[PDB]
Write a protein that binds this ligand. Structure first.
Ligand SMILES: *[C@@H]1O[C@H](CO)[C@@H](O)[C@H](O)[C@H]1NC(C)=O
Ligand SMILES: *[C@@H]1O[C@H](CO)[C@@H](O)[C@H](O)[C@H]1NC(C)=O
Lengths: 104, 439, 49
């Protein structure tokens, strides 16, 4: 296994051999069929796959913040009609349509 | 002007530099070091070699009692064995039987191999560096030797230069170093006079031609048998005559960073780590005027085929329009790419090509030609092979590096929902506007 | 360099296939087959006269 530095290998009384790595097998391209991550497989395979994993993590955190705003938004759209005893708020929920828009 | 450059300590890559003297032409100069070695300090501690036992003939003390006068010799040893009986053609050598004793005595010494074939236990501390470097200076592949420390100045051909000091003070040698006739070993030798018996390190001398040596050979003189008139003595195995197997290997094959170690003197060439700063200084006599250089217009660069390999995998083609006829230097201003051409001859409205290379997939890049910026972009390909037998040049790169549509993808997927979180902020402020006007 | 392709099993039709290494100029390549000789395996049961 030739390292990212490079290999020296001597055999017998011959003058030794000097080997080096290059770009990969490279079953890869750039398109709508992606083949992008395989380009990743020469700039550090199994290093900064932590970057794409934490990138999936920060996008799931972003949509988790979307879950946070949706639960705060449903709670604060229930806030104007907590149980306001008029039984009829058309210009609240007709203008709003959070949940159960049949309740006047 | 004076120009200070820095080059990483690797052999086999033409590094380039630009000396910018304002009011004058740029100076794209080339350096390439061909060999860089270390000269560790010479201090031989002790020679060591193969011993030889010196055994005098026995002293058959025929029915008297002998003794031995304790002469001071290195590993002198003696015993008077009683009750001996030698045999010859007339059986016993002498007549009587009871008090028949035998004075036996032996000692150790050097050999003739110590005159020629030995090992030297050696002390070596911090070193100097010496190197040889080729500069492509204006159609001249010049080459200058200099011992690099920051303290040696050499001027040739209207060029003054001070090389060194090195940045890494690492050295492949430890304190203890043993040399044999074509190889070195970083092994702690036992100190002279403190030689453990049997193992390597026993029989020792300071100079190769002393008349005194130190030894530890555990010599025991056993009892002779009946008629076997000889010297029954304990053998002393010395580390040299079996030293051949436990060598492991020389430092040629145990070194870090690929140093080649040649003896007499013990140089360590191509110890490739770190970087070296160089100071070059040059007056006007090679500097070219700004207005007397042919300025150019109509910068039209493009790349027909780039391939991000280790060879010149990109041939960039550029059509231009100059002012007059003369030399023109070309230079890469970012470190993603590298060029193999110092300067080219340009007459007017003409076209040239250049052999560049980079490491990544897709990059845009602005070249300078005789203080004229020209930007062109390229999308490249990887080579189909996996292993080559030479290091590349551009492959020092970062991790935040430009690409193809990858950055359009990362600009896509961060679309954002924080604006609709701000819409939730708007619904909470429009409900809190009833009583949110005090704090 | 290395190329794999599929031609349809027809006789007497010219065909061309594009080979493209990177870097160098690509080539188009002309080929045409003439026969597909089926050689089945033989074994003699008997003769009759
Ligand atoms: C050859 O022998 C001489 C004297 O024995 C010694 O000084 C010299 O270093 C030796 N050289 C080699 C190459 O063995
Ligand atoms: C200097 O040496 C290099 C070694 O490859 C060669 O390519 C270059 O053309 C030489 N230049 C001159 C001016 O001798």
């Amino acid at each position: 296994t030739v390292p990212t530095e490079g290999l020296e290998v001597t055999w017998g009384n011959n003058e030794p051999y000097k080997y080096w790595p290059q770009m990969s097998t490279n079953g890869t391209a750039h398109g709508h069929p992606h083949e992008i991550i395989l380009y990743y497989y020469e700039l550090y395979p199994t290093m900064t796959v932590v970057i794409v994993s934490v990138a999936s993590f920060v996008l799931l955190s972003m949509v988790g913040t979307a879950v946070g705003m949706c639960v705060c938004a449903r709670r604060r759209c229930i806030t104007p009609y907590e149980l306001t005893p008029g039984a009829t708020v058309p210009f609240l929920l007709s203008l709003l349509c959070c949940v159960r828009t049949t309740k006047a | 002007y004076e120009h200070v450059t820095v080059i990483p300590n690797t052999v086999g890559v033409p590094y380039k530099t630009l000396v910018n003297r304002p009011g004058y032409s740029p100076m794209v100069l080339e350096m390439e070091l061909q060999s860089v070695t270390l000269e560790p300090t010479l201090s031989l501690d002790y020679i060591t070699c193969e011993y030889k036992t010196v055994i005098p003939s026995p002293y058959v003390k025929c029915c008297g009692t002998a003794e031995c006068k304790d002469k001071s010799l290195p590993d002198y040893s003696c015993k008077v064995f009683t009750g001996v009986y030698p045999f010859m053609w007339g059986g016993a050598y002498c007549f009587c039987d009871a008090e028949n004793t035998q004075l036996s005595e032996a000692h150790v010494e050097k050999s003739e191999s110590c005159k020629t074939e030995f090992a030297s236990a050696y002390r070596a501390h911090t070193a100097s560096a010496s190197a040889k470097l080729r500069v492509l200076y204006q159609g001249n592949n010049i080459t200058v030797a200099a011992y690099a420390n920051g303290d040696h100045a050499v001027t040739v051909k209207d060029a003054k230069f001070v090389v060194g000091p090195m940045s890494s003070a690492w050295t492949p040698f430890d304190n203890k170093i043993v040399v044999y006739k074509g190889d070195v070993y970083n092994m702690d030798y036992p100190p002279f006079g403190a030689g453990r018996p049997g193992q390597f390190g026993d029989i020792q001398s300071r100079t190769p031609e002393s008349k005194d040596v130190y030894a530890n050979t555990q010599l025991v003189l056993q009892r002779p048998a009946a008629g076997t008139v000889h010297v029954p003595y304990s053998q002393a195995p010395s580390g040299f005559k079996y030293w051949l197997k436990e060598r492991g290997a020389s430092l040629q094959h145990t070194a870090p960073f690929g140093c080649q170690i040649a003896t007499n003197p013990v140089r360590a060439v191509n110890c490739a780590v770190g970087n070296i700063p160089i100071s070059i200084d040059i007056p006007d006599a090679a500097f070219t005027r700004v207005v007397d250089a042919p300025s150019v217009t109509d910068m039209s660069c493009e790349v027909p085929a780039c391939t991000h390999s280790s060879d010149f995998g990109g041939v960039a083609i550029i059509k231009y329009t100059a002012s007059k006829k003369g030399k023109c230097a070309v230079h890469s201003m970012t470190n993603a790419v590298t060029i193999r051409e110092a300067d080219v001859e340009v007459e007017g409205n003409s076209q040239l090509q250049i052999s560049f290379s980079t490491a990544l997939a897709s990059a845009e890049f602005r070249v300078q030609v005789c203080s004229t910026q020209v930007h062109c972009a390229a999308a490249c390909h990887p080579p189909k092979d996996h292993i080559v037998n030479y290091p590349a040049s551009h492959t020092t790169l970062g991790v935040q590096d430009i690409s193809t549509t990858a950055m359009s993808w990362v600009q896509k997927i961060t679309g954002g929902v924080g604006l609709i979180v701000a819409v939730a902020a708007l619904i909470l402020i429009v409900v809190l506007c009833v009583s949110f006007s005090r704090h």
